[model samples]
Target: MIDLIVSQGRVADRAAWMIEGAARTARALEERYGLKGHYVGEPAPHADDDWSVALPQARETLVAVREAATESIKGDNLTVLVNNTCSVSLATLPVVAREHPDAVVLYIDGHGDFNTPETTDTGYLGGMVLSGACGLWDSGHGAGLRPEQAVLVGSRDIDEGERELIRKAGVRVIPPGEATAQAVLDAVKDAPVWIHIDWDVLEPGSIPADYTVPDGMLPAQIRAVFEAIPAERLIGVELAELNAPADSERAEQAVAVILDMVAPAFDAAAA
Candidate 1:
């Protein structure tokens, strides 16, 4: 069984609800699959909270999760999922990178997440997570993962700065046009891919999640990507930015779709 850490975001209230959902989901996942270890993210402020408020707290959660990954779990086969709407911070990446140096990260998001604070016009940390993974942020924030190691999937929006960062990092950016379900699967076939799903990647009414983007992939398209990718390659999985209560039907629909994507892998294990 793998360790499930409910990584919180900046808002305390939002974190509370998200952590609860994650905990509940982890419990269900554990019971359904005979998995072990469901850990809660430490704590953090809101999106409107100061950068200082979130980064340090995020660092703490990252450290805690890393400790669990190394000391508690301590195996080459384990996976840690980061489930934060605002989890795309520069400071958060290093902790995970250092601890799970060998784990292949399978990032599934709508936005490119390659923006640095300097280059970011919106100042949303979530946009720059991929950038931090590639070690481009001078903010001295986030855990920079090696660019070559990251397999970016599902991006319809890419600004000038983000595109430059992607080019310089030499990270693989799988465009919607270039990524057939098969292509995305092949991208992470041999690595310990970590799946990070941000609901915003879906069309407006398709699935309810956070961070909306244009030209979102259809549910079938998204599922195809998951199906094409080998389950053996996935080290961890996270479904983030999904606000079930507020999003009502959208949240539930999105959750169901995500579970469908995951069901096949779990079934294979049973087989």
Candidate 2:
């Protein structure tokens, strides 16, 4: 059995409709795959200046995610979280890491999402989530993730400040072709990992993704990377940044590919 946590946290983006679209896509996948999923309650209203305003709902969502993960562990099932945007990673990943302290994060994104309020030039909360998860900044939520254990891959749009933070944190940055399962296995050194996939990690023209970068891993490349990761080493999974899509068919196709890549984990857990 594979359980899901669908979180529609719109604070990362001001538009509520985008969040709703992402949430719909998540549920659509759940039904398409016949997977049992629980959608987390809607988040509170948005706040522009303070990302913390979303934390309360984010925390509540994390509680549901944590419980689902725990239940999955007990039942020998896999827990998969499908989120509207990457900002929820600020809440979910830390909680996931706390449950599995040996957990490492394999963050696949176009941008590092590694900015803090201090370093951000655009005041984007989405960019600050990973930094908060890695405890680089005080996010109030305990960052159970260690810098050395967090690996960022397929990132071609990282800011210089974010790059410096990555360097200072000693986080491994793997380029597109080099983001192999072997490399990830070597990086984690056999520790269980939480795989975080932001849809934009795919090639700019490959999918109808949010924030597509110039050069990134293709859908096949990303699928291969996930396929190579040993299921036993995978503790949890998160797919984010599937925002408002101009072409619903393309987004659906992309989501289906991702579901296939992760299905092995659910199968392994069931067996």
TM-score against native, each model: 0.77, 0.84
| Stretches of candidate 1 exceeding 4 Å from the true structure | 8-24, 34-37, 42-45, 71-73, 76-82, 86-104, 138-144, 206-214, 246-250, 269-271
Question: Which tens-of-lDDT digit does each residue in 1-271 have in candidate 1?
Answer: 4555555433223333555445445555666667765454554434554433545556555555555544533454435453656353243345556766765565667777777667867555566666766677654444557887777777767787777778787778786666677787677655656666776666666354556543766666767766665656555556666555433554455456656666655555434
Q: Tell me the tens digit of each residue's lDDT in model 2 across 1-271.
A: 5667677545456444456556666766667667656766565444565565555536665565556555655454466777777776776777777777887888988888888878888676778888888887876656868888889988875777779988998888997767766776687787887888887787755354656543677776666666777777777778877655535776666556666766656566545
Q: Against the unseen true structure, what C-alpha lDDT does each candidate score?
A: 0.59, 0.71
Superposed Cα deviation of residue 185, candidate 1 (Å): 3.2
Return model 2's CA RMSD, one decimal.
3.8
In terms of lDDT, which candidate is strongest? 2
TM-score of 2: 0.84
